[PDB]
Amino acid sequence: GPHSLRYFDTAVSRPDRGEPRFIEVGYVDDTQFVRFDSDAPNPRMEPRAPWIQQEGQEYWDRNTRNAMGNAQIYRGNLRTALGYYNQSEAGSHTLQIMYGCDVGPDGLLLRGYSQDAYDGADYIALNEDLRSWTAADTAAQITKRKWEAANVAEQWRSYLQGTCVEWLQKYLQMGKDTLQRAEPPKTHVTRHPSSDLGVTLRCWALGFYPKEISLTWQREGQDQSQDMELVETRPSGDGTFQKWAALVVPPGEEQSYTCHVQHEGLQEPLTLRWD
């Protein structure tokens, strides 16, 4: 299917420290592969997956110069963000940046990103067309004015359409065994009765990759909702994911309901019942 290369950048003004701490993580799809933290005395870009370790020195040196680069920019943007809002030197502040490319099954660019948030709220963002910016308020609208004259949009566009996309392909090649595995869920249903009041059936999916999965409960064709608890999909800690969907059903009727599991790593959809 489609794939993505995404960097998640967090700069935090301490401010009982001369510098704010910069953290960057890089992902292909839902797998992390690189890391930069400003709080190392050596601070370099580091591998966080075995399949990136084959890159040679120049890959690590270029990444480190760029993260050094962007850390000093974001520090600057922290200082700038105080005055554009009349703000207290006492309080700690957060700048987040997400940028990356999202690419289709044939390698076309579908969506490119560069976007920013000050203390959890939009600030500025590159538009779907990568030729314009939407600024969240008057503070950001001046930053925009500056980025407009600078034609930084063209700098992002060119990165997102060349570098970002070409490297994503490379990463999908190098990490093939990890990133292109279609690893199916391991499934089972539990039952937990509750007096004579009906019965919690919980359908589980463990050990799957990628992240996207559908768990639904049906009876007589119809998806159920009423005492239907669905947890947020969650990392298992070994590159795989887990989730579950639980439904309260009447006593005696356990077998009228079926859990429907849809995943990339399954030949065809799966239908479970409690036994």
Binding site: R65, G69, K146, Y159, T163
Partner: peptide, 9 residues
């Protein structure tokens, strides 16, 4: 690959 961009703000 990370981006090398660039402008003051």
């Amino acid at each position: 690959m990370t981006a090398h961009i660039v402008v003051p703000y």
